[PDB]
Design a protein around this ligand. Structure first.
Ligand code: ADP
Lengths: 56, 371, 56
């Protein structure tokens, strides 16, 4: 007659799975655009530098 | 006294002294020969250039890489390469210097045999040794466990190591590397109208690949994007002006490493061969290997390769193991760095093959645990 | 009986909540790197036309 904690902790685990799902999902969603901006800067650095030498 | 570390590889010879921090001499491992006749007498034109000399005289030569896929096919040009390295790049008498040589796994036995024989007869070194490129590349990374994915210019191999033990039954070698990517790029550059066929201009294509190409995180999305917009087109000026522009090709080319079918090969992609090599190891060590993917070799230097690699191998692996990819910013020289580290040791100073020993036991000594 | 599965369920509740926390931390750090990389890219990319027209 002590199953209330069973139910409550099962639901705890379910909602924790939901939370980690959402969190890590949006997490990698962020890092995708992060590495996108990394390619952006790595590209435009080169571009600015070469056009700068052209200016020199 | 000092030891030498000559990492031959395909495409790029990189040599230097043991204990240093970076190879002193680095130059393309090619041998050029003139293909016209020459008319100005008194020019004293030599008959065979080599290294950067040939790379500069490209316009009138025919270049021949003497190492096809990790293996040496033209021994005379390889001897020229070694001689030039010693006597001009390092400018050192090899008479009093133990030298460290590298080779890929699963090579012809006669390769390392004849290599040792030449090193002892022609150059007459005091001692030598042949090491596996992947082990050295692991040394340089300051690790002692983890699959190492070395992908040079000629060959690509995975070697899983744990606690300093190698699992040879899971070493997976694959013959797709930078040279094949260069050729595939030469091919698909036709469909824009650009035609490079000369061995000279294969080098131009290699430069284009080293500069512009990159790996796409999602191939289909990038394809559709390049279709829609034009924000991916980049230009490039050839050695005589006539700037060219390439679009889709930038990520079409290195995508081959993940879909070898593009060049008509049947084997699985890089990520998949890595995952298989993992699965062939004992279950108890798979988590560490998942955590310690190492990458070396110039071909692993594409912008974005580590991210795509991680995504794919994450898709293949379970969702509870942690996937990491150790991609140092100088990984192109990790083999030479690890070689210098190992040669500098003293626990290693008794693993050399002394010339006396070889004279006593013949070139078969190599395969013998005097490795 | 089921009490021991309840024990394990509470323990996994703990470690899953910990995963949620790590997820939010990496989320915030991702947004921080987003702000910083965006500042850098924007500061360094809007000027190509300057060198361009000058050499022009
Ligand atoms: N920045 C780069 N981007 C893409 N590919 C590169 C880059 N630099 C070098 N490579 C490729 O890597 C090869 C050099 O790799 P390397 O490790 O020297 O091979 P090896 O070990 O056989 O000498 C070259 O053939 C070149 O095609």
């Amino acid at each position: 007659a002590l199953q209330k904690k069973l139910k409550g902790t099962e639901d705890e685990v379910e909602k924790y799975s939901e939370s980690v799902k959402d969190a890590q999902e949006k997490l990698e969603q962020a890092e995708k655009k992060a590495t996108d901006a990394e390619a952006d800067v790595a590209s435009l650095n080169r571009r600015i530098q070469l056009v700068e030498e052209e200016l020199d | 006294t000092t030891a030498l570390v000559c990492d031959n590889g395909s495409g790029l010879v990189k040599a230097g002294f043991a204990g240093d921090d970076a190879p002193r001499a680095v130059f393309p491992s090619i041998v050029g020969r003139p293909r016209h006749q020459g008319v100005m007498v008194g020019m004293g034109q030599k008959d065979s250039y080599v290294g950067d000399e040939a790379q500069s005289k490209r316009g009138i030569l025919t270049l021949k890489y003497p190492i096809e896929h990790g293996i040496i096919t033209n021994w005379d040009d390889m001897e020229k390469i070694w001689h030039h390295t010693f006597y001009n790049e390092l400018r050192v008498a090899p008479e009093e210097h133990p030298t460290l040589l590298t080779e890929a796994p699963l090579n012809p036995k006669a390769n390392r045999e004849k290599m040792t024989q030449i090193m002892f007869e022609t150059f007459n070194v005091p001692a030598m040794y042949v090491a596996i490129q992947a082990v050295l590349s692991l040394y340089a990374s300051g690790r002692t466990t983890g699959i190492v994915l070395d992908s040079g210019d000629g060959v690509t191999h995975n070697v899983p190591i744990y606690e300093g033990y190698a699992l040879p039954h899971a070493i997976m070698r694959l013959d797709l590397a930078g040279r094949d990517l260069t050729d595939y790029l030469m091919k698909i550059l036709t469909e824009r109208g650009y035609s490079f066929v000369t061995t000279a201009e294969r080098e131009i294509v290699r430069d284009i690949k080293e500069k512009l190409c990159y790996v796409a995180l999602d191939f289909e999305n990038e394809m559709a994007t390049a279709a829609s917009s034009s924000s991916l087109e980049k230009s490039y000026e050839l050695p005589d002006g006539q700037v060219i522009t390439i679009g889709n090709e930038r990520f079409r080319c290195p995508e081959t490493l993940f879909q070898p079918s593009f060049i008509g090969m049947e084997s699985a992609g890089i990520h998949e061969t890595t995952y298989n090599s993992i699965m062939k190891c004992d279950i108890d060590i798979r988590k560490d290997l998942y955590a310690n993917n190492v990458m070396s070799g110039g071909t692993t230097m594409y912008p974005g390769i580590a991210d795509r690699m991680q995504k794919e191998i994450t898709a293949l692996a379970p969702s509870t193991m942690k996937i990491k990819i150790i991609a140092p910013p100088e990984r192109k020289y990790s083999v030479w760095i690890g070689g210098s580290i190992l040669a500098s040791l003293s626990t290693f100073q008794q693993m050399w093959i002394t010339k006396q020993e070889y004279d006593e036991a013949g070139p078969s000594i190599v395969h013998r645990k005097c490795f």
